[model samples]
Target chain A: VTVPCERTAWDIGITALYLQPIYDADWGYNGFTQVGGWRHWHDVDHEWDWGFKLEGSYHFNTGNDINVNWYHFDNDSDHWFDFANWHNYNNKWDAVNAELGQFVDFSANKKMRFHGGVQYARIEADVNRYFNNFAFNGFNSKFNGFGPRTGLDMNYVFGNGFGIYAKGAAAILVGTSDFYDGIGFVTGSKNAIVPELEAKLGADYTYAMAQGDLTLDVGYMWFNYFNAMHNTATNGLETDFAASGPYIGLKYVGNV
Target chain B: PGNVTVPCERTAWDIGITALYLQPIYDADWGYNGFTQVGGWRHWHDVDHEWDWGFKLEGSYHFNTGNDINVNWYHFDNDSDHWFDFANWHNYNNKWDAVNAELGQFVDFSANKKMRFHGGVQYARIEADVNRYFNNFAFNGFNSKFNGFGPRTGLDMNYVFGNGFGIYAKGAAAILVGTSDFYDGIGFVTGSKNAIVPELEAKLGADYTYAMAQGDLTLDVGYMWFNYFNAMHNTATNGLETDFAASGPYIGLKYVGNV
Candidate 1:
């Protein structure tokens, strides 16, 4: 008698992420003059931040599945000089994202699936710029958005227990962005529209067991948030952010 | 016992200790600005140093179905007098201390029990101190401490190819929320108050499990990364915040048995 394959109906995994910095900018008019001059300036440079991600999925006997994914990164850096001689331009950026979706296997061997669902994305930034030597400006802004998302996942398993996989998703977000400035006593509130994208390509080594299956995968994952949010007119500036990188992941599927 | 089945097949408890070489990275910005007469002038400082020695003690309890709960404590300290001093004239002394306890469920995946999964809640206490000195005279310093508790989760797997030689991978995250306290040369400005922080720890390595007369012994060698974010802050120093992180490889030995 041959031993039965131990495959779990549910699986969960963790990822160690390393992402490259995304560029950000703020633009507005310095002041209203007979012939107004534009502030034309402020750039926020992000440093690489190391973070983690969690993802899980459940499979029903009917061949349908549900999945959830969450990830976050917190990075800090200084801004380059533009309009004013900027020093001590300390800035911190935090991004958190979550998504839930449902899918059905479309391939005959059940190796591929297409899914659609809802996603929520949030971004927060804290900026402190010291001008010349004495004057200082502190600006804090937050953006929260939700929208529709869709994606496809494909996996191919070889006879030797080695597997290759690819997944991609895109979404459009609509929400509100809030801004506060300590330098000019300025505050801004506005509606925000953002576009998000994600993609992953990887290879895995699977081990079949009596109780469940374990797999380890190494690959690259990319994520981008286009025009996630911006500062208000009070500071006469607007801003946007994005991130992408390679990751190593581990997953366990249980028999339930 | 004509037709009986044993429910709990393995040992009930395990304990071990590890000696690790830790390298710490630290960064913070604070103080007041004089240009605009802003009360807060921000000064940025970062620590650059090599690896130092440290240790960890861990314990766990196992159930009959091969599930377990684990707890661990780790500590390390380092100081820098070389490289570049802060503000071109100030030297720094830095120290870090932490404790963590977790209760979780473990599931064995392989019939030979080579792979396992662990997830649960973790509580942690972290404290750090940074002293600034000029010309051998201590003038300014900042000490901050934080206590937090939150969910801890991760995955662990071990596979033996042959001759008891194997490889293992493990990763965990603790999202903690609690209180913080801060002090400077001027005195206490931000009192003990509530704060939120996150800590990430991971290890990947090679192992060999040996069956001795008394019990099963395992040895591991690999690399590890530990990070504690926003652990310290002070409003008096213009809302200065500090983060501590370290990465290095380590060797460990552990024993398994029923208690």
Candidate 2:
């Protein structure tokens, strides 16, 4: 006799690349995937994906510079096979954010600095794919919304082989998408941020040591996107930002 | 041994032909993993464009270019599906155990070894099998399929100065049309207004050679843009963001000889 249990196939990744002024160019890509299987159960969630970004920057010729970055995320999963309850639990979401502003230079020789940037954030979530008429709890009839965010960052470097930096961000919903009228939900209220004004503040410290002409250094950083509770027509749960994690690593440099 | 000239001044043409073949085993992992053993053959023809537009014809018989779309997770709670929800878990199969063809040509625009234009078109039949499951049940036999009469065209331009470097640009577009559902189980329904989707693309770069006939391929990678109409093959998971642009620097090498 064979009972039923859940077994998950998991994969996660973290990648980073750096381009020094003299090295040419640099960028980074990082993301993860999760899969679960249970007694004859098959489903695809986050299968085919697409992301577009428009980012640009203008640095001051010598001191305090300006920078801007924009990002857009959109995903569709309609034809997935295992999603019997696709219409009920299935959802489509699109979001866009643009960050603009500059960093100030405040150092003995421009070594210490302060940075600030404001962000315009907008998100739209839709459930129309479930199409009314499907006998399932996943289709609540409410979908879509827009939001705005703001943020600031600060950093300091001491001549004594020590440095620290921190930053914070917040967002609020301003409008909703068209999916709200299909199902009965407080027409305009259901569209606000799952939780209004989400925020995150974190800092990191770095240390360096020199052995004759050789030098060793280490540093760490932490940030969170602030997930919120998704209150759909059927169920409600808390989601804290898409992801949040701390990174700690070391680097060694010497003339060999 | 002395150089001899025929008194008749008769021209003798040289012709050469060759055939190539490739066979490989194909396997896939779904809830159930499967494989197919197959082989294919390809032939080519080339001509001089000195008199008229030069042309080439090439064809192939592929044992199979299988198609499959596997959707695994169901977020029945939201009422809408997203690409991030199913990472290719559901299996749709469309395999082509058939043939394909491509014909292309180059038109000389100048005689100073400086400028030229080239173009080509391609047609193919790629097949696949698709299976859609819901509530632990497979949708009726609505899954098998293939792509046919897919048409593709391209244009290229080259400008040379005989000394410094040459600049070139190429653009191509292809449309994969079929009578049945997506041969790649992951395809949307055929016969739909957009059943026969098309892909539009453009590439811009430059090449620099050190000598008259040889050099390196350096196309200070500028930008690449693509638009897919009718189907999502290229922009499927990218939301409606089917249009994208990328720019960077790249370098490559190549070897050429009179054959």
Candidate 3:
């Protein structure tokens, strides 16, 4: 006997991501060019990091639902180099959102989901540089932001519980940045507008059980938080934070 | 408007473990060519990795008749406590990431019973870097790393009798196929190897839930046994393999509500 996929009032999912953060780094001169650029080796230019994401949804009898999502990356790195000195670095990146989503079914195999919402995101960074066991120079830059966000998610179920999906989202956040000289005196406080975008492509699988349905999703994803980190490097220059990598998630859904 | 507690439109897990890096610190300032003690017994920078906490963050998003998708480190440094015969740091570390996408089923028989089952395509990579020194300067060390991906299947069970409470259990296993390699700076040696690394765990706990205006809140408290076979290489009792194992109590939280 084949049990139909049931509709539920709720949905919950947890995903794990392995990403490398780039365009986020420090001051170390280009030894060859002698350019007045990043002088220290404290760089996150290609350090692959680990993080996780959370998403929950509620469905009404109508083809509508409310969704919430939160994402974060936990990462840090350090070194003890005599030639270039010691460089210790750590960062914070997060996104919390609440949205209203509408579902549209085109065929028995094709469907699209769209939503609009408010998102609160944050980006933080701290760097410590040393010269021969003495404090050389360092700074702690941070931002807390909020804005309106919207996105579309689509799926095409092909055969035997197999399908492919894609997602894209954009947001314009008006937030504040606080820059300090390495957790000490506040150098400056400013207000700014930051634009952000994100995208994902994945392969999906669905199975109907004797009682409910289960789905598994695996994909490659990319996100960019523009002008997200603060720095007084060379007076005032904002930095962009971006991550690209693969993720895996498992989910269970059905009517209660 | 109102919020109700129901099955997952979303669900999540957060777990933290207090770990001490047991990676062998070979020849930690053992007598760097020249050494002496006041009483002539023996003296070396006795370095031991202290205990600290590392967290595991997990989350899930479910679709209502549709599907879509998406996507920690540990280090220790205590240079403040330094001495002449001191080894400032180990500079030896092990780091890894485990990510997987899975498909499965959910079952509910009686009004009080529910179960979740899943199979996944998994990916994981492990890297280790170690640098030794005669003093505060790095001299020689070793590096070992591995990469693999394969299949995983697991099941979770929960039973609720009454009074916003219940009991839960879960179990899972996976085998990864890939390659492992190592390079020794101390002896100028290197090697490449194949692997079928495995991981599994069993969990037992108490489940409690309460529906509030925001959502249905659920909490779990219990213990689990976790194992990762051939997780790494060690110079102590392990020449090329070290099975990492942990058995401890844990706390978990979940929410199910209206959209």
Candidate 4:
């Protein structure tokens, strides 16, 4: 069962995110690893940091919809450690994600929708280390890709103004990674094909007010990028990045 | 004469998650010459103006006789990239994980249960890992763990405004005697095995509450301070002492069930 559509014109909201991105890499060096060895590179577990997301959508009278989402995250740490190498490392990473999609309702009340879209993602990283009389500095890498994606979005509402939602999406990406390392003096750039996935599960409570529609959401989100980059600049290396954690957000839907 | 009164529902249980910003202080003396040497002794890495992020899980249940029991788990890990001891550049990384369980009684001192008192016994476990690096190589590393059970007492006072807004101040102190173990890379230090230590904590915050269909939801912003005194010792014959403490602000959201 579903409630009839009440507001169908447009909706917009802001999202605050907390993500713990686990970065794994092969440095192609011995006795100087962070978490492990050549086969198992350092597993750098990042703390939860703040990022911003913007979502906008237009609902058609036929129960179909169109939407766009944009998100950005930039973080840096001077204390990324290497357990095997016994060296203190510094790293900076930033990502930009943008997607545009069309949605078709699968339920009578339009509570569930299947969406297909085109996505563009860009990520960049810089790392450095200092030890003894030698400084390992200015190692840089960047990845940029575009691909098609498909996902499912479902929402269930209870009589008490409480609701639950689940969304999952996957995309196959083709991209290029650029690398440069000052220490190893190696630079190898090549094409990379990867897969990306994102999922979210959350509960929201809505309150009707004179100003607009207000919702408070609490949930968990997981995202992964497989084989995001590979560099042979030093010896040979492949990097994979994954993030999963909890988040809380507030949204306001206004009449247009 | 007390004439003004507000009607309120008492909550029997609550469960919540919290995010904290922690600033830790280190005041320790060690024999390692990697840092400064004062009177033939060196200070354990002095770090200031550094902050880290932490997370917590907490739950509480109220009894029929104005008593309650609470349990909490909190964790945070941080590393310093650049620190200097004289002319030598060194790095330090540490992790803190702790669990606390307490039981106490409460009394309402104002109308609408606006102000209260809670005091009781507590049991806590604190674990830490410390690693020091010099010239990009591991110089010294140690792991210390402690467990304590003792009497803990605190006061919780809050004033609620008519529009579901409130401010609160809560502070607690405990004198715990517990055993600690120390390890220094190669093997366990003989002198540092099974040592006794103490722990303490305090918190203050403000909150906004609203009634929901299934429960009451509250959002809080606050500051907390925690300390474990003389919890670590050296393995050498001239046993050295080290202290761990942190203080910072946090934001939390919770749901309390009404009976």
Candidate 5:
């Protein structure tokens, strides 16, 4: 889906990409590269992915526009956490996720403009890696899920094309605690509660020199998982969250 | 991209001695214990997006005591760790780029007969892709998007007694030590730890060759095992389960032995 519009005296246009869900790799040893490159080491059947999205913007009289976007990614990979064969057990992974949000006058004008929006996303993973078949007593095959939300995102911009932003989100999760992977198995579905929060401060700058337009952007973000959730592994079980990191990137554009 | 070759100065016996060597293997294995590998497919799209190709030159000199020194260099274009959804969890999949070089030696305990010992060392460089979903996390799950260096070493011993009996033992270790960060559920964090894994394995098998006029026949059986030490770790301590030692047995039979 796509939408384009022009505001008062400025031309406003928004382009979107919503492809039919695509299957990354096919069943078994599809003709897709699992490692090294996309070159296939084996030949087999394959499947496609699925999903849809809408993104567009409208220019306001104040030289700024509102942008709204939504995206959904859904697919299932045949590779499982096979334990019996000492590889990915019979446990295959099926997952789906969706993202929705809207930002206003994010980056416009001479310097920087304030931007804020709300986003919500959910993840569903059906794990069955421990046992080939779920017929055995200790053979566990269960579905674990979480719905995290970007309830709020507020930012402050400066005149030098620099600013800072902070965001808070809540995740409502439901899944078996005694997982067969990631963490060790526990008794009864462990009470699962996972809260996620993120904060960032960054700077952006653009120079119009003879070498076309060169832009530099930098940011540092912090994320915390506030609840104890079991991760999938060779053995299925729910465990506490233990992970985090920082991010940085740069971009340059030139005419040839 | 284009290629340009500069002609060498002409001289006595001036010749372009270009040596092109070709080595290929054609093999097929079958047995009463038939194995069926199901589920497979092909990728038609992005035929050019991700790619890999490489070439290597290796040589070794043998000594009187059945010992030799060898060296080889190899480069892999890309390394991938994929996820189910386009984003999240496995989102930062296919996250690293790397190149590696190896230099080592081969020792033959019984070079004259069908028995020998071999070992070598390798140094590798890994560059990670951070823009992916897994790299976005900040805490324990935070996977750094950068580069790392490591060393790998391995040893193997093989023995073939007479017509159809053979046995072998192999061991290997890889150690990655560098200034790096750790990963949490949501992002990347800082940490300094050597992710290492050392493994040892042994295989014993007996092969019988039935001298036939029409077709050559061979049968063999063996067992293999792998024990990993910190080879793979998980932040999901409780939910994740792993078996350090996994052993299994296998059998094989072949009918074609020539060409």
Candidate 6:
């Protein structure tokens, strides 16, 4: 069950998430609506959002492997509080990593892979707080960070090519934080320090095929930046940005 | 070794939303009765306050030993307008909001008792607006306000039993130094002054923690008392000070399970 028929080449996979997520804001704008009176602008949180992650690894004859992964999510929202008066918000965050790992045999029908690597991530926000289609105030906040990353992937295969797995990672990224005010005439950039955490827990069932092994998976995922909200408005870089959701995926291992 | 039914990892977190039902009072400052004859007496009217619904947001971390820390915020703005016999009417609105965040460390006190000591920072703003009118007039208004930021410290303790029932209490205080200003009618009467302010909060309640598929969820209900002492000095009202006090009930849902 180890070689020849399974000549090592590539292990590539993809996961898609369709879930509902909550968002936060410190008052996008508080103004008077022509028809609804006075109101405060906060993003609607119950709407469904979509995200995906793609990863691929190359195996060596010595049983060690190297992989690259990228995770991306985007959000678009339009809120109308008054006739011809409204607010628009766009939130997008992404992460890219390069890692090296080694398979470790557990001495359960169990096994794991220990990995350490480096990653670069960015969270960008764009907002428009407008009134009467002309009177308006708008802003943008973007952050970029890079640092070392590490994680552990554990699995237990009970029987019939079925198993459960837990994967998690931690990283600390340091970089520049930028903010631009379209109407305030007050705009600047500053250095930012951030802490990142991510995890996934899932169950998998593998189908033995003539060409290779295809695994069907279902899971939950969560990612957060412990201190990623950067405010140079008067300046305090102590807030956080995070998200969590359910996902389904397919992973394939085959020889090229 | 084939009995594994769950993932080997259990990194958990707590995030929740809370509803606040509260009332606010000004320390012996303005009387709701306004000296109108009551109870067969020619004078003194009892002081009364207003109650409204607000909200809270909490996000915390859980470690291996069942301990936690907080990055939470709860705020509300109180506004009300009063009108009397079209003869001579008056109105007022008082508003304030705050932010409190703390880092906590656990101390082992008893087998079923847990305590966390926390220290953090505070930022607050308190403002008051008063308007008086004649039998018929345009507008006459007076304003007093203060804004500041400072450090805060607190503690949280809980006593748990076998059946998931627990008693929990928490308290914290902050000292602030900042700018105070007063405005009268149409112009700035008192430009600004530097002052120090003190504020505090305390809560005691019952909580139940239940284990679920992905994590543990805790449900809690409690009463809270908050006080902002000498929050603002209205130079517009001759030696008249406003000590803000708000108290009420709160219910919350907290989770402690896989992140």
Top candidate, metric lDDT: 6
Model 1 agreement with the true structure over A186-247: per-residue lDDT tens digits: 78888888876555667788888787888888876655565665665323244335455678
lDDT of 5 by residue, B1-259 (tens): 3221111221111001111121111111100111224365432211111222323334344332223344544333333333323344332222222232322223333422233223233344332232234436532332432233333334455565655555655554433322222333321222223222223335555556565564346565555443322222222222111213334454555443222
| Model 4: per-residue Cα lDDT over A125-210, one tens digit each | 66655554576565778888878887765555654568776666667778887888777678877777777766666788888868
* Native contacts present in each candidate (fraction): 0.00, 0.00, 0.00, 0.00, 0.02, 0.00
Highest DockQ scorer: 1
lDDT of 4 at A223: 63
TM-score against native, each model:
0.53, 0.26, 0.46, 0.44, 0.26, 0.47
What TM-scores result for chain A when each predicted structure is judged separately against the true chain A?
0.74, 0.41, 0.84, 0.78, 0.36, 0.82
- Put down candidate 5 lDDT per residue, A149-196, tens digits, no spaces: 443343444444454433333345554444433335433345454544
The better-scoring model by TM-score among 5 and 6 is 6
Residue by residue across B1-259, what tens digits does model 1's lDDT show? 1221123445567777888888876543332221222357644333455568878778887654444667777767665554234343333444555555543334333433444434344566666555555556666566777776654545576666756688878876555546666655544322343454556788888988787666678888889998866566553343346566789888888887755
Instruction: Choose 2 or 5, whichever is better by TM-score.
Output: 2
lDDT of 3 by residue, A35-90 (tens): 24312222123466778889887776466778887888877866453455665677
Task: Flag regions of model 1 displaced more than 4 Å.
Answer: A1-118, A121-142, A147-256, B1-8, B28-46, B82-97, B103-114, B186-192, B235-239
lDDT for model 2: 0.30
Interface C-alpha root-mean-square deviation of candidate 4: 19.2
Report clash pairs, candidate 6: B12-B257
In model 3, which runs have C-alpha deviations exceeding 4 angstroms?
A1-7, A24-44, A79-82, A132-137, A182-186, A234-236, B1-259
- The residue ranges of model 5 lying beyond 4 angstroms of the native Cα positions read A1-52, A57-66, A80-113, A129-256, B1-259
Model 6, A1-256: lDDT tens digits are: 0111223668899989875433212221223323233222222333458888899988775546789988888888676655667767687888899899877543145556778999999888777776765857777888899999987665567778898766666678999888887555767788888876665667899998788889889986655575565443312223356566679999888766
Residue B1 lDDT, candidate 2, scale 0-100: 32
| Model 2: per-residue Cα lDDT over A153-210, one tens digit each | 4343444555444333444544443323334443334444432221122223333435
